[PDB]
Structure 1
């Protein structure tokens, strides 16, 4: 339970306690609600709106559900309650579901699925007999009446958008669709954009972008789609693309990019795709996720939440929040408390305060808690100042022949330099440390010695959540090194390992008893090349892209460098990077070397940025700057 220092919370929508105005046959009554689910928390012009399911009788998905809203004009001290949308009232189990919310001006656009009488889960329905898809538009107006600031919201009659759903898509016959739940966006050209989950007559699930250029009068689907198996998509716009982050049951979450309103989808292999696991071993159901772009203290970042689900199934305990600038991926920490069940969530950033509406579940009775994320916003601002300082400090270095090109920070993701503890080498970017053994701190890095010496920067080793999954598609690992002793055989100095030992490599660099380098390319025959001297430091660059590895000493490729390291159409799964040894006592090499300033970029640096880092190795360390 990390609800941070100075952060606190209330139980806003109290299961079996909070009442709503329930309407039926021309009569409104105050009704105690069983469970509140599917939190959507937004800002309309300074009115904090909280939208959710009111699951009246039971938390069963297929039961009687209206869309409730609660709205506050004082940043969630007091709230007014209403029912935003009501179901058909056609049976005891009629329902409007997966409320998905777009804010635009003083308007709230809410899309829901609607079901009349089925008790089966929607993905199992072989047709659309019980289903409709409805947009209701709520309008917020703002008074300062009788002295104090007041507000209300008038909700419109839902309008069916079923006319806008084609009966065919590529290679399939359509079935039903719903919003991804949570909060959607207005694009920077003004369009309304819902990422939606859709099923076909084969009952497969897959995600699309459903949009409107006309304030919601009419609706299109992007031509493209996600893989099958992708559900509850949640989307934001980042630097002119849509980022569509999807739930994938029993798998790691797939993230996609689309630069043309969803006409073409490319998997975001270089950044965020397959980063987040739905459970420790990613073999459990996943979750709805809050996924938004904000500007905090002048930097555009993204915020993402998803339960860790230690418990497995749909329990979905331990809601975590993540920060990213589409390069570094920082775990802010756990928002929910202890081991409580805590599946959906909605993060709002408003007037430079952070808030989160999330579920808590005990025994299938759900409340939505409203939390003030003050400590979290503090951690975030600190991590961001850190990102800003290192990028600015690296980028103002005057690189030598006054000045050559700046040290590149585009795509720099991790940085091991001057800070280290007794057993860890610290990421200056503060997201992923390397563990160490037999490590002696020297300026801007470590000196390693003896069997099992070295550092380990985890890749797949990060566990359920893998920030460095990009490395499987491209990376550049850079480092200054010095060999202090002539090894007895070939010893490692640096590389990306595919297994836990370091014995099955993707790409690495070793050095041998003959004073030669042994760059290693996958499982290819190793060929010693070049020459070094005990005591001279050297600059080393490993790049991999397009399934091609290359090794540089002092800014210059080794002879025969640029070989195939991925020997077929399967994607590697890198376990970790090893630095200055294997950091394994089972591996019988002894690397006696010093390694300074390890940089990890999410791309193949080009000739010039490699030559700049080389000539700049003495200027980039963190040493002076702490």
Structure 2
């Protein structure tokens, strides 16, 4: 939890009571565990929705949906049961409450089970299952001269009639919300991303939506891959971005422009960025994933545990910030090594909050954290993003002024700022490690075995912000060679392996004053000519499985070669700059590199020309 931030145990395990209703009697009843946080703002009233697991944290046990609500931003709360289970047996339950706010109404979608003791995807049929929608209406008033609120909950309505018996290629079984908070789309639709099972017990994600305030519901025709569960969605630039849990794998993210009729994996942005554990080989989690506007900029906030401990313990809840280009780790919201899986982040009246689980010995509480420090950090990073983008766009490029320098898809920028061991990203997301580097205006001068910079791709580890590069990228730099090498030496490239020996696309230079562009594992043909001490502009582009190399805005002879040989997707280890930064490699690159730009797409010819013409205008030197 950041400096300046603080929390309380709001839903306290084995302590907090809720109004348990049965057979017309209400009794204040202590709850064993609280799970499934959803934290929202309803027209000024903060509402926290959760599971009240009365007897045990076991998933398949007695559970009602609880709400707490506050009119004073969480200083005090009132408590109610929003949705009661069927009371059919000792384990009846309403589950995984998923919330949409529209106007002064909360729409809460829950599964309902009567008597099963088995995990939902293990059920061979829907004998025990229903899917219910309850609506809460929030009214504000002023008793005793003070602002008050109340929430009146409707009786739940089954949406089972809207679940078709078949979906292409399958027979349907059950579906549930993806927990947390869903959305109202820009056309007014209520949109729940849902997790669905078929009779083969496969799980997949769909979009489940309503055009008439929840009276009737439709499924979008498309779907995720099998294995994509518990989805969470937001709307971004006219599209749904649907962010899915995949147990034992990296999270898949999809886009859909047509209310889920067609799903496209978001390979160029967010898909496969977030891993569920260090080695992405453990269970995944529910995630908060929201679009908000902070100081005038639309951005997304994402949470997920790092899960160093493994299995479902899911320690180390982390918060991420992205503009759909750059991806910034705000940091750890939870405290120390506590277990902290499910979460919900709310941005209300320019204050940031998080309701999340803490788990000791499978006894769960929800803490309510005031993310004061995290908001400060987020505002700082966004100011940096805005400022660098403004600055680059403002430059009057050489013909009045030529086309603007493009900042669309500009993810990273290595320029003047460097510490002894790192070359700093101006966008503050991913620094490059360095060795044997000397600071120069807007870059670094390198020498010696082991020398260079490493800008990590898969080497980022669990969370891979530059995964897009496996699909398309542009890497740009200004270079000067200071000594003729003994053989062929590296200058810039994308490496498939950790050494740099196995390249996707690169540029080397040789003892005969020629360039050696490297296209995957294709035999290298030297070409062109360079002069010691002269500065050159280098662009490497990769898209559509094809790699190109440009010097001074022009493609080397024979460029435009296939670099992805066989339909496996690349797994780029890192970009290397100014050497390999590997003492295991015998090369000595004596070179200066300035102003390294990374984009998440293949730039066009105009954009490349503009960068070349503008290369002495773009550095960060005069600003820090």
Render the CA deviation track for 1:180-228: whole Å, top value 9, x for unaligned: 0100000000000000000000000000000000000000000000000
Render the CA deviation track for 1:576-622: whole Å, top value 9, x for unaligned: 00000000011001000000000000000000010001010000000
Please state how far the C-alpha of 1:146 moved relative to its aligned partner. Answer: 1.9
Pairing 1:182-197 to 2, within 5 Å after superposition: 182-197=180-195
Q: Distance in 2 between matches of 1:145 and 1:606?
A: 64
Question: What TM-score, normalized by structure 2, do the two folds share?
Answer: 1.00
Please state how far the C-alpha of 1:40 moved relative to its aligned partner. Answer: 0.3
1:407 equivalent in alignment to 2:405: yes
Q: Distance in 2 between matches of 1:377 and 1:179?
A: 29
Residue among 84, 87, 112 paired with 1:86: 84
Render the CA deviation track for 1:288-341: whole Å, top value 9, x for unaligned: 000000000000000000000000000000000000000000000000000000
Render the CA deviation track for 1:456-484: whole Å, top value 9, x for unaligned: 00000000000000000000000000000
Pairing 1:80-479 to 2, within 5 Å after superposition: 80-479=78-477
- Give secondary structure in 2 for the equivalent of 1:471: helix
Render the CA deviation track for 1:328-382: whole Å, top value 9, x for unaligned: 0000000000000000000000000000000000000000000000000000000
Q: State the match for 2:33 in structure 1.
A: 35
Please state how far the C-alpha of 1:401 moved relative to its aligned partner. Answer: 1.3
- Give secondary structure in 2 for the equivalent of 1:624: helix
Render the CA deviation track for 1:88-133: whole Å, top value 9, x for unaligned: 0000000000000000000000000000000000000000000000
Q: Distance in 1 between matches of 2:146 and 2:85?
A: 34
Please state how far the C-alpha of 1:436 moved relative to its aligned partner. Answer: 0.2
Q: Distance in 2 between matches of 1:401 and 1:387?
A: 27
Render the CA deviation track for 1:117-167: whole Å, top value 9, x for unaligned: 000000000000000000000100110122000000000010000000000
Q: Distance in 2 between matches of 1:354 and 1:401?
A: 46
Please state how far the C-alpha of 1:490 moved relative to its aligned partner. Answer: 0.4
Question: What TM-score, normalized by structure 1, do the two folds share?
Answer: 1.00
The RMSD of aligned alpha carbons is 0.3
Q: Distance in 1 between matches of 2:587 and 2:514?
A: 16
- Give secondary structure in 2 for the equivalent of 1:526: coil
- Give secondary structure in 2 for the equivalent of 1:403: coil
Q: Distance in 2 between matches of 1:237 and 1:99?
A: 20
Please state how far the C-alpha of 1:452 moved relative to its aligned partner. Answer: 1.0
Please state how far the C-alpha of 1:386 moved relative to its aligned partner. Answer: 0.2
Render the CA deviation track for 1:9-47: whole Å, top value 9, x for unaligned: 000000000000000001000000000000000000000
Unaligned runs of 5+ in 1: none
Q: Distance in 2 between matches of 1:424 and 1:146?
A: 60
- Give secondary structure in 2 for the equivalent of 1:404: coil
Please state how far the C-alpha of 1:539 moved relative to its aligned partner. Answer: 0.1
Render the CA deviation track for 1:236-295: whole Å, top value 9, x for unaligned: 000000000000000000000000000000000000000000000000000000000000
Q: Distance in 1 between matches of 2:616 and 2:119?
A: 62
- Give secondary structure in 1 for the equivalent of 2:385: helix
Q: State the match for 1:61 in structure 2.
A: 59
Q: Distance in 1 between matches of 2:609 and 2:512?
A: 27
- Give secondary structure in 2 for the equivalent of 1:390: helix
Render the CA deviation track for 1:469-519: whole Å, top value 9, x for unaligned: 000000000000000010110000000000000000000000001100000
Render the CA deviation track for 1:30-76: whole Å, top value 9, x for unaligned: 00000000000000000000000000000000000000000000000
Q: Distance in 2 between matches of 1:97 and 1:503?
A: 52
Q: Distance in 1 between matches of 2:62 and 2:399?
A: 72
Please state how far the C-alpha of 1:5 moved relative to its aligned partner. Answer: 1.1
- Give secondary structure in 2 for the equivalent of 1:58: coil
- Give secondary structure in 2 for the equivalent of 1:612: helix
